[PDB]
């Protein structure tokens, strides 16, 4: 009835090209994903991590994968990186940052 939802992002391809820092990126996530209102209310309701070259997001509160593409676009737009990196779905719910 409650349900958990994981969400993967293969940040590899543009991380392995320097221009992407996963570091301050899950940072962008960890304090801007809003929960029934605002930022950092993730009261162990949602979690973010970085399997070296992956980001893992697991929600229990209202969180759609569209929201995920929405946040990162902001990050990407924030740090100039839009032009060079798409947020894309591959397999369902498993997303990846594409370079070129």
* Residues contributing to the site for RNA (CB under 7 A): 5, 34-37, 62-67, 69-70, 73-74, 76-78, 82, 86-93, 95, 98
Name which of 14 and 22 has its Cβ closer to RNA: 14
> In angstroms, rounded to a whole number, what is the distance separating the alpha carbons of residues 30 and 92?
23
Q: Which one, 2 or 91, has the nearer CB to RNA? A: 91
Q: What's CA 59's distance to the chain center, in Å?
A: 12
Q: Which residues pair with 59 in a beta bridge?
A: 5, 46
Nearest distance in Å: CB 55, RNA? 15
Residue 21 to residues 28, 41, 42: CA-CA distances in angstroms? 11, 24, 23
Q: If you count them, how many residues does the chain have?
A: 100
What is the nearest approach in angstroms of RNA to the Cβ of residue 22? 19
CB of 88 to RNA, least distance (A): 4
């Amino acid at each position: 009835q409650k349900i958990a939802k994981t969400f993967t992002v293969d940040v590899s391809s543009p991380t392995e090209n320097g221009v992407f820092d996963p570091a301050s990126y899950a940072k962008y996530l960890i304090d801007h994903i809003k929960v029934e209102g605002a930022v950092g209310n993730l009261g162990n309701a949602v979690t973010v991590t970085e399997d070296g070259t992956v980001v893992t997001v697991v929600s229990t509160a209202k969180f759609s994968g569209k929201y995920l593409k929405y946040l990162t676009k902001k990050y990407l737009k924030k740090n100039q990186l839009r032009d060079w990196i798409r947020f894309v779905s591959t397999k369902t719910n498993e997303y990846r940052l594409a370079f070129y």
